[PDB]
Amino acid sequence: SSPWRLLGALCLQRPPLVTKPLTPLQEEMADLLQQIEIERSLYSDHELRALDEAQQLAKKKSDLYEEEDEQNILLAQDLEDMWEQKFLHFKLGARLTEADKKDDRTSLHRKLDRNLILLVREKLGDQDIWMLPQSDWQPGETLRQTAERTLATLSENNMEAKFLGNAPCGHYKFKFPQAMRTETSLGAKVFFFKALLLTGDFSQAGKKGHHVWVSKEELGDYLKPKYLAQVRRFLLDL
Amino acid sequence: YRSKPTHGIGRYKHLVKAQEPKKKKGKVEVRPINLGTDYEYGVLNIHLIAYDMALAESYAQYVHNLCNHLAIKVEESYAMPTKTMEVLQLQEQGSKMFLDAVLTTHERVVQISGLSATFAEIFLEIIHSNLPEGVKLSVREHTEEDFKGRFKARPELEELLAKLN
Amino acid sequence: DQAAKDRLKKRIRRLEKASQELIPIEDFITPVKFLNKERQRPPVELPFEESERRALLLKRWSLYKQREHEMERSAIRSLLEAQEEALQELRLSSPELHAEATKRDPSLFPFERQGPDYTPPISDYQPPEGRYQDITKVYTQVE
């Protein structure tokens, strides 16, 4: 074999759930684009009924010789009022859920406009280091399958995640401290595979002490500078 | 002239392609579908489906322009025919329906050529990350069945096909 | 009898020799509904103060658009390099797994994904009932 230990790490990523807020520059241009649309457009059917009210009202003012006094029942402005009242009465969800207020860094309902990368805490050498989920490579098993097996080893998980082909997305080499360093196992090579979380979440047994979900902005806090550098390379900011 | 050292200085037909003219009788979209290379995927169709015409086309242009910058060959940028569905809601305290609204679906397809297996992860990562709002990305293989929806219906054949069976 | 089958076979070939027509896109073909229906906007008045700020803003938008391309092109550059350097590094250490990681594996397509929505789906929501009719104006032609 080789002195280095082959490991398959899984970079599970949650796609954003809500649209990110518009920047101040984009807000000004969005108004301009909508303004141009109205200027260069024609009159819609509702806009036609706006003049239809004007046509009838003008008759009610000067040309009081209309043949039929039945006409329609509703008005274009009244139609808008009917939809406006339903819309104002109707209520939607909140973009910022209770997870953001309580800073619950474990639930999947935090930072719906951002991306959350799964982090777990593993104890090695009587020391807890937050790292991506990983598993050791085994004979008769491709490196991609090693990351695939890591998902099934999670504590009470039903999550379904789509992987990305078979090629890797990054690497990280570290060597054991000289206290436990031997020629048989000089170090290990960690290979990262990206996956998209479709559906599913962890159970209620263990949440705080097992796994957390953070974005790239706060990702470095839980990591260390040597391990952090390789992670940020393949992590597309979003 | 042949014997002169300057022979063949005017050669140009080997610079441009043959560019076979679309003959009246030979007019056919002969597409040699490539399948299963060592590192090159087959012909792929990037189906972008959205309810708004402007939003669907705007993201379609971004995909087409992105491929050109990444040296990805784009065979065609056609558009699937639109589909219109009549939205009917149920009236409360009753059973009879009423016309609620008329919603349509707009589909834009950016057909792409083969890409390296390594680039498959990277190229798709950019696409799904930039889905603006409600655009249903669908990257499926370019089979003839997926390409049949662009054409019309032929009841004349179906009259014969039914009697053939 | 037997001759009628011959014509049925021949009628198949005669229709086959015809072109496969494509449905025209009605999105690119404006119907006659908007064909000069008196629905013309009045002569648009553009204030001079509005014009100067509008054009000046577009200058920043062109600059800001280039900024998005610079970071996006840099981001894809780093992502391409990170995957390429790891793939080559693994090849020397584990040549057997390199072949598996580069060969076309049909484990990715189809890759159907949807875009994010304005609001998250609320809990315990009961939308009303109804039915979806599909008019989808048919286009059948014969030759």
Binding site: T19, K20, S41 | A54, N130 | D117, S123
Partner: peptide, 29 residues
């Protein structure tokens, strides 16, 4: 980068007016 393409316009010359309508899905989205 989810706001990099939604900023657009109906690129046409003879089009009827369109209004922003917030459509809710089967769920609360």
């Amino acid at each position: 980068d989810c706001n990099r393409a939604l900023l657009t316009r109906l690129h046409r010359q003879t089009y009827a007016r369109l209004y922003p309508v917030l459509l809710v899905k089967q769920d609360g989205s």
